[PDB]
Amino acid sequence: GGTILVVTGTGTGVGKTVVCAALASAARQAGIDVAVCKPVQTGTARGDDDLAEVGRLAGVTQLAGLARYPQPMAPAAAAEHAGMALPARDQIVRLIADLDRPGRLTLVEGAGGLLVELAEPGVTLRDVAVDVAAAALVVVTADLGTLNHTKLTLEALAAQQVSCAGLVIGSWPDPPGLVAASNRSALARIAMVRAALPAGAASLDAGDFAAMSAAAFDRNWVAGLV
């Protein structure tokens, strides 16, 4: 196959989607073919659509999903509200495995943090990563609490031998400030910080997003992903 990375996070709304876009954009600019899978999208009544964000910010066209729940809740509660079950583990795993091919960077986004339920019954993004042998990129904050959440997420990955490909600070404040500066230095002590996306990047137009994306990651690390 090619390279598969789940893009998880220490929590909800930490920047997972804008980080998928940013890495997709840098990979494409490096001449790598990119696909992005978001198996379960919720909050569609208010128009949440993470694949649309990736398609618009980074230009990706191979964008796969399996389910769309209208309520703005976590996948299991939204599915409980709708009275319609989440997809099954095999559905999600085979979708990603069908996307993966040599020369392709395939990114997978779940919902919220690493352990929220993505498929019936109780299967997580960590389970999916195991079944498709993906490594994990962990999107973090630089705010109070991040080191604990980062360490807890990194331990949960190592507990099932899911490799950690790096950290990304999904939203880097301007100018950093005292906590954010201390938090970035300490995260850098426990894993490589691949990038720190400036705050508000997800509202850039595609041209600005691409230039920002190619400057945010290290040219060689992106080139070597596939």
Ligand X SMILES: Cc1cn([C@H]2C[C@H](O)[C@@H](COP(=O)(O)OP(=O)(O)OP(=O)(O)O)O2)c(=O)[nH]c1=O
Which residues are part of a known binding site for ATP? 50
Least distance between ligand X and beta carbon 138 (Å): 11
Rounded (5°) CA angle 53-58-61: 80
Give me the count of residues in the chain: 226
Residues paired with 4 in a beta bridge: 106
Residue 136 found at the interface with ligand X (CB under 6 A): no
15-50 b/e with 16+ CB inside 10 Å = b? Answer: bbbbbbbbbbbbbbbbebbbbbbbbbbbbeeeebbb
Rounded (5°) CA angle 87-13-135: 60
Q: What interhelical angle do 16-29 and 50-58 show, nearest 10?
A: 30
Least distance between Mg ion and beta carbon 15 (Å): 8
- List binders of its own copies among 14-53 (CB under 8 A): none
**Among 5, 54, 116, 119, contact with its own copies (rule: CB under 8 A):** 116
Residue 68 found at the interface with its own copies (CB under 8 A): no
| Active-site entry in 38, 89, 126, 149 | 38
Are the beta carbons of 112 and 9 closer than 8 angstroms?
A: yes
Residue 151 found at the interface with its own copies (CB under 8 A): yes
Q: Which residues are annotated as a binding site?
A: 12-18, 38-42, 50, 109, 145-148, 170, 198-202
Least distance between its own copies and beta carbon 188 (Å): 13
Site string for Mg ion, 156-195 (x = CB under 5 A): ----------------------------------------
User: 5: closest CA among 131, 134, 154, 160?
Assistant: 134
- List binders of Mg ion among 37-96 (CB under 5 A): 50
Residues 147 and 150: their CA atoms lie apart, in Å, by 5
Residue 199 contact, options its own copies, Mg ion, ligand X, none, Cβ 5-8 Å cut-off depending on partner type: none
Residue nearest to Mg ion (CB): 17
- List binders of its own copies among 167-196 (CB under 8 A): 178-179, 182, 186
Residue 145 found at the interface with its own copies (CB under 8 A): yes
Are the beta carbons of 115 and 126 closer than 8 angstroms?
A: yes
- Tokens representing residue 138 in the block: 């962990």
Told to judge if 151 belongs to the known catalytic residues of this protein, a careful annotator would answer no
Residues annotated as part of the active site: 38
